[PDB]
Scaffold this active site. Structure first.
Site, PDB file in Angstrom:
ATOM      1  N   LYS A   1       0.834  -1.195   0.000  1.00  8.50           N
ATOM      2  CA  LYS A   1       0.000   0.000   0.000  1.00  8.50           C
ATOM      3  C   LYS A   1       0.876   1.255   0.000  1.00  8.50           C
ATOM      4  O   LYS A   1       2.242   1.057   0.394  1.00  8.50           O
ATOM      5  CB  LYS A   1      -0.934  -0.004   1.213  1.00  8.50           C
ATOM      6  CG  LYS A   1      -0.191  -0.032   2.548  1.00  8.50           C
ATOM      7  CD  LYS A   1      -1.157   0.199   3.700  1.00  8.50           C
ATOM      8  CE  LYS A   1      -0.461   0.097   5.054  1.00  8.50           C
ATOM      9  NZ  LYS A   1      -1.001  -1.121   5.634  1.00  8.50           N
TER      10      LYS A   1
ATOM     11  N   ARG B   1      -9.696   1.036  15.469  1.00 13.64           N
ATOM     12  CA  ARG B   1      -9.645   1.724  14.184  1.00 13.64           C
ATOM     13  C   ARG B   1     -10.874   1.282  13.386  1.00 13.64           C
ATOM     14  O   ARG B   1     -11.983   1.746  13.657  1.00 13.64           O
ATOM     15  CB  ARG B   1      -8.331   1.421  13.451  1.00 13.64           C
ATOM     16  CG  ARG B   1      -8.012   2.372  12.299  1.00 13.64           C
ATOM     17  CD  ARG B   1      -6.563   2.244  11.835  1.00 13.64           C
ATOM     18  NE  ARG B   1      -6.290   0.967  11.176  1.00 13.64           N
ATOM     19  CZ  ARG B   1      -5.122   0.626  10.635  1.00 13.64           C
ATOM     20  NH1 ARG B   1      -4.093   1.463  10.662  1.00 13.64           N
ATOM     21  NH2 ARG B   1      -4.982  -0.561  10.061  1.00 13.64           N
TER      22      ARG B   1
ATOM     23  N   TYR C   1      17.817  28.696   7.633  1.00 10.61           N
ATOM     24  CA  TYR C   1      16.642  29.468   8.039  1.00 10.61           C
ATOM     25  C   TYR C   1      16.511  29.556   9.554  1.00 10.61           C
ATOM     26  O   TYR C   1      16.771  28.585  10.266  1.00 10.61           O
ATOM     27  CB  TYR C   1      15.362  28.847   7.474  1.00 10.61           C
ATOM     28  CG  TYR C   1      15.170  28.998   5.983  1.00 10.61           C
ATOM     29  CD1 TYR C   1      14.948  30.250   5.408  1.00 10.61           C
ATOM     30  CD2 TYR C   1      15.180  27.882   5.147  1.00 10.61           C
ATOM     31  CE1 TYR C   1      14.758  30.388   4.036  1.00 10.61           C
ATOM     32  CE2 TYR C   1      14.992  28.008   3.777  1.00 10.61           C
ATOM     33  CZ  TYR C   1      14.782  29.263   3.229  1.00 10.61           C
ATOM     34  OH  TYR C   1      14.596  29.387   1.873  1.00 10.61           O
TER      35      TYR C   1
ATOM     36  N   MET D   1      13.726  23.156   1.524  1.00  8.18           N
ATOM     37  CA  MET D   1      12.828  22.404   0.650  1.00  8.18           C
ATOM     38  C   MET D   1      13.572  21.462  -0.304  1.00  8.18           C
ATOM     39  O   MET D   1      13.111  20.349  -0.561  1.00  8.18           O
ATOM     40  CB  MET D   1      11.936  23.368  -0.138  1.00  8.18           C
ATOM     41  CG  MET D   1      10.746  22.717  -0.824  1.00  8.18           C
ATOM     42  SD  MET D   1       9.582  23.926  -1.483  1.00  8.18           S
ATOM     43  CE  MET D   1       8.758  24.456   0.015  1.00  8.18           C
TER      44      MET D   1
END
Lengths: 356, 356
Positions: free
Chosen positions: B33, B129, B253, B301
């Site tokens: 999956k 769940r 940053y 990024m």
């Protein structure tokens, strides 16, 4: 089919780009690197091309993807070429190139190109990511100018802490940049999303807004100009399972949430593989059927769990907003102890629908 | 081109799957999956199909992808159908379908199917769940048995805390499952990756290994059986920028890292958009040119920053491993305060090269 879908408001995207131009009064490169922050570079570029000055991406393969989709607006390679034999492709496709290191300068100076290319010479003015030392900046400019492989030179740099409005580092970087370039006649580019929105005195012939376009604020605090932004992406899915639990019941992996009271529980078709942060703790806000609720327990790979105790007429088939116009992405990001930049890029598997 | 690449060791994938059978003595559904946890669902399935019992995915669209590629081994829909009109597609392509709620049972009971289908009836044994209540389990079985739309019934459930070897929750869940099923004659499925490796006396005719196949351990503690696992994915890039800095200099940053001493700094073509966790703090290990170093400052990024002070003959073009056989994915995940599951799924942009 799986109810999970990402809605992309293109009209809002156009609105946020115009805002960058309107507030700054300069040319704007729409920064659409990393598949336009997970929004879809191709569809976003097509929506803006008619009225945009150009685009900016991370690498050549992102830029090639745009040309193959019929985008002929100017495209800037923010990191430039990684290998020297990328240059012939840069000339062929007329890409604007960034030079951030002396080794990149050597490659251009030595190669023989069919047509001259635009160079955006990057200065390291205090961030210490990529960029030249101030001492080399003038010398590097004069070498590019007398190359005959370069047609135009644009001077650029980047801010380390422009999202912090109290911090004066942005002013320090400007002073470093101006001092390093003074005497030289060329167009300049300094401003990103935070600098466009909150730093009106910073000079820029070209601005480079990224996060702005996608309707998210780069500040922790409220900002008058950033309040005008319109959220582009709406991530939504549906409740596929409803369960009633008594008090003292464990929910999800690791039993990291135990029911403090009798509760009604809902399972949503959305997981961390889709791009929703696993770092988001219990209490993180949705948003189900026009009412604000909360996330409960661990986020699984494809499924997450929300509260339905205080929302009486919600259940199977109810629409749940993970982020959008109602739950701002910045809220989910700040709760998961991160920035909106990242959770946008993580978007996967879900179909992107475009409208506006 | 951008030097960022993910190497997929398919030979090790074959090895890890054989290990699941070898240790458990039962049939194994390879859980692929989320595009096989970011490794590539199609290519992984092809490499396993000849010697695999079957495959498991999250949704019908992940299953349709496999049929389009020519994979005709059995495929289990772990969450079953989301909408009722998915059934004609399930019959057509012979997908095995999970029923976790009564509304799905109603949908199959009311519809008229061309051919009968396999139902994997899921019990909520304590995770809370998806799955039926133990009270409804026997009743739901008899409705499926006397339907004529159902060919075979497998009884399944899922563990919440199987990765915790000290915890007895797994024993409690087996007791609840056994108690709710006893009397009924059918094949059973319970075991996932941690239960296969470290829960030997737990019954399962069908095991469902996921993380196992990709060479990562689900345990915090060292485990004998888990040490035999071979890492599949190697995520690597190269140094594109080298900088020497004095003490007291901010990096990246937000200036979240300041140089404590004079250092040599390297910039690597890998960011959080590619799949590398931004949550990874200063100290997180690479791995550049066979030598263990550390991550420095905030991850951008597309770019991250590493230490090159103690590695003398590393510089421009040096290969950097982010995770793989030298740096285990669990080391990066535990540093970024998460599980290997998530960082695998976050993989994007980078090309995957299949070998072994």
């Amino acid at each position: 089919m799986r109810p999970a879908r990402a809605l992309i408001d293109l009209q809002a995207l156009r609105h946020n780009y115009q805002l960058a131009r309107e507030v700054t009064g300069a040319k704007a490169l729409a920064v659409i690197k990393a598949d336009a922050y997970g929004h879809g570079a191709v569809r976003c570029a097509q929506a803006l091309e008619a009225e945009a000055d150009g685009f900016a991406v991370a690498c050549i393969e992102e830029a090639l993807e745009l040309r193959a989709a019929g985008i002929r607006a100017p495209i800037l390679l923010l990191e430039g070429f990684f290998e020297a034999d990328e240059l012939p492709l840069i000339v062929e496709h007329d890409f604007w190139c960034v030079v951030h290191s002396l080794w990149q300068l050597d490659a251009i100076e030595q190669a023989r190109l069919a047509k001259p290319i635009h160079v955006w010479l990057k200065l390291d003015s205090g961030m210490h990511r990529v960029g030249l030392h101030p001492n080399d900046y003038k010398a590097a400019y004069q070498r590019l100018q007398a190359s005959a492989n370069v047609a135009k030179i644009v001077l650029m740099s980047h801010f380390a802490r422009a999202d912090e409005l109290d911090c004066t580092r942005s002013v320090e970087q400007v002073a470093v940049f101006l001092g390093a370039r003074a005497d030289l006649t060329a167009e300049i580019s300094l401003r990103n999303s935070p600098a466009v929105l909150g730093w009106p005195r910073v000079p820029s012939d070209w601005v480079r807004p990224g996060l702005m376009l996608y309707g998210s604020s780069p500040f922790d605090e409220p900002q008058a100009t950033a309040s005008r932004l319109q959220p582009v992406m709406t991530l939504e899915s549906k409740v596929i399972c409803v369960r009633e639990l008594p008090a003292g019941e464990p929910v999800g992996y690791g039993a990291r949430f135990i029911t403090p009271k009798p509760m009604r529980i809902g399972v949503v078709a959305m997981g961390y593989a889709d791009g929703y942060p696993r770092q988001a703790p219990t209490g993180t806000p949705v948003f189900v059927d026009g009412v604000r609720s909360q996330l409960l327990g661990r986020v699984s790979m494809d499924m997450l769990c929300i509260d339905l105790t205080d929302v009486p007429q919600a259940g199977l088939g109810s629409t749940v907003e993970l982020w959008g116009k109602n739950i701002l992405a910045s809220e989910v990001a700040t709760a998961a102890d991160t920035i909106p930049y990242q959770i946008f890029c993580n978007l996967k598997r879900v179909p992107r629908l475009y409208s506006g």
